[PDB]
């Protein structure tokens, strides 16, 4: 039996695997502090692994084994630079925009604020100014220009 | 059997021959302290 989720480490050194709803669920899989220590897992890590039905007196299924972390084999977890330790730089890879239902918006944005990778951007508008619709256009344009980029909304 | 000591063979334990059920009746409560009501909760904050 296989389960998957995102790692959420508790105060007590153990964690749970969550679903898209991003909360506590009945189907979350227990992860012992051990597995965390061997695989050097961290909060937000995506864990997939074969699980078993919980034993009697157990309320949550337990991850018998870890197969992949963040879609890659667990070994790279032990030896990797920590995110906090990554060298920040300026956004050096522009992302050019277009969305078919409104190319006016995307082209104006490109002419107004070209987008790069690592961008810390903001759109500022009063209520009812298309900010939501503009964000929709950006989502659509990124899902056409940069499918490789993990698009989280 | 020294002064009034009684020596017993094992069998009376092998047989269900001297036993009773003892009943214990514990109790607790939560209060609303001016420092803060004492929630009856499952939480042990610190360690385990
Ligand atoms: N590019 C657009 N074309 C047509 N209608 C728009 C456009 N941008 C905004 N609107 C209209 O403005 C209203 C508010 O847009 P939206 O950004 O979704 O809400 P808010 O800006 O209040 O969060 C919507 O009802 C929408 O019909
Ligand atoms: Mg809005």
Q: CB of A102 within 8 A of CB of A153? A: no
Q: What is the DSSP string of A33-80?
A: HHHHHHHT--TT-EEEEEEEPPPTT--S-EE----EETTB-THHHHSS
Structure determined via? cryo-EM
* Ligand 1 pocket member A123 (CB < 6 A): no
Backbone angle region of A143, left / alpha / beta, with phi > 0 → left and psi within -120 to 50 → alpha: alpha
State the resolution, in angstroms: 5.8
User: Ligand 2 centroid vs A23 CA: distance in angstroms?
Assistant: 24
- Total Cβ atoms within 10 A of residue B40: 9
* Ligand 1 pocket member A130 (CB < 6 A): yes
Q: Which contiguous run of DSSP H or E holds residue A136?
A: helix A131-145
Q: Whose CA is nearest to atom 22 of ligand 1?
A: A128
Q: Distance between alpha carbon B34 and the CA centroid of its chain, in Å?
A: 32
* Ligand 1 pocket member A129 (CB < 6 A): yes
Q: CB of A74 within 8 A of CB of A68? A: yes
What are the b/e assignments for A116-138, b being 16+ CB within 10 Å?
eeeeeeeeeeeeeeeeeebebbb
* Ligand 1 pocket member A44 (CB < 6 A): no
Any binding-site annotation on A18? Answer: no
- Give, in order, the Cα–Cα distances in Å from A17 to each of A39, A49, A65, A88: 15, 10, 13, 30
């Amino acid at each position: 039996r296989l389960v998957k989720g995102y790692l959420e480490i508790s105060q007590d050194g153990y964690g749970f695997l969550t679903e898209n709803l991003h909360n506590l669920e009945s189907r979350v899989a227990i992860v012992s502090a051990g597995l965390i220590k061997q695989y050097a897992l961290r909060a937000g890590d995506y864990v997939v692994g074969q699980a078993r039905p919980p034993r009697e007196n157990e309320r949550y299924a337990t991850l018998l084994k870890v197969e992949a972390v963040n879609n890659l084999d667990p070994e790279a977890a032990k030896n990797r630079p920590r995110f906090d330790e990554l060298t920040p730089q300026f956004p050096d890879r522009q992302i050019r925009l277009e969305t078919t239902p409104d190319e006016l918006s995307t082209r104006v944005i490109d002419l107004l604020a070209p987008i790069g990778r690592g961008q810390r951007g903001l759109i500022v508008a009063p209520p009812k100014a298309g900010k939501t619709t503009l964000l929709k256009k950006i989502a659509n344009a990124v899902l056409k220009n940069e499918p490789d980029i993990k698009v989280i909304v | 059997n020294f002064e009034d000591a009684i020596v017993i063979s094992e069998e009376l334990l092998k047989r269900d021959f001297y036993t009773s059920i003892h009943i214990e009746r514990y109790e607790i409560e939560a209060r609303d302290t001016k420092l803060g009501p004492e929630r009856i909760t499952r939480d042990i904050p610190h360690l385990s």
